[PDB]
Design a protein around this ligand. Structure first.
Ligand code: 9OD
Ligand code: CL
Length: 117
C-alpha cells in the first residue's frame, strides 16, 4: 500500500526530467522512502521539482492544500489535513530547502504513510 501503481506511469516523464535536472539517483529516493532525509540539493530539489510538476507547490514552494487533498486517497485526507496544520506554511532558505523542512516534518508526523516517489 497505498499508492496506486497507475501513479508511477503518470509521473514517469516528470520524474526522469527532475532526476536529470537535479542529479538525483533512485538510491537517494529509496533512502528518503526508508525515512532517511538529508539536506542534499540533488534530492531536495528533486522533491520540489516533482511536487511542482503536479501543481502541488508554487514558485516559492507554497503548498496548494486543495490540490494536495484532492489528489490524496480519500482515506488519508484526515491525517493529511492534520499534518498541514502542523507543517504548513513551508519554511527554509530556498524552494528546495523549504521542501526539505516539509519532508522531515511530514516524515516525523506520519511515518506510517510517509512516501516519496
Ligand atoms: C515525490 C512525491 O511523492 C510527490 C509526487 C506526487 C505526484 C502525484 C501526481 C499525480 C497523481 O497522484 O495522480
Ligand atoms: Cl521565508
Amino acid at each position: 500500500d497505498w499508492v496506486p501503481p497507475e501513479v508511477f506511469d503518470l509521473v514517469a516523464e516528470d520524474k526522469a526530467r527532475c532526476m536529470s535536472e537535479h542529479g538525483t539517483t533512485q538510491a537517494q529516493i529509496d533512502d528518503v522512502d526508508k525515512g532517511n532525509l538529508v539536506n542534499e540539493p540533488s534530492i531536495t530539489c528533486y522533491m520540489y521539482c516533482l511536487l511542482e510538476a503536479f501543481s502541488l507547490v508554487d514558485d516559492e514552494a507554497n503548498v496548494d492544500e486543495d490540490i494536495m487533498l484532492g489528489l490524496l486517497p480519500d482515506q488519508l485526507q484526515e491525517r493529511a489535513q492534520s499534518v498541514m496544520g502542523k507543517c504548513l506554511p513551508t519554511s527554509g532558505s530556498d524552494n528546495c530547502n523549504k521542501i526539505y523542512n516539509l519532508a522531515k516534518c511530514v516524515q516525523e508526523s506520519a511515518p506510517d504513510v510517509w512516501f516519496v516517489i
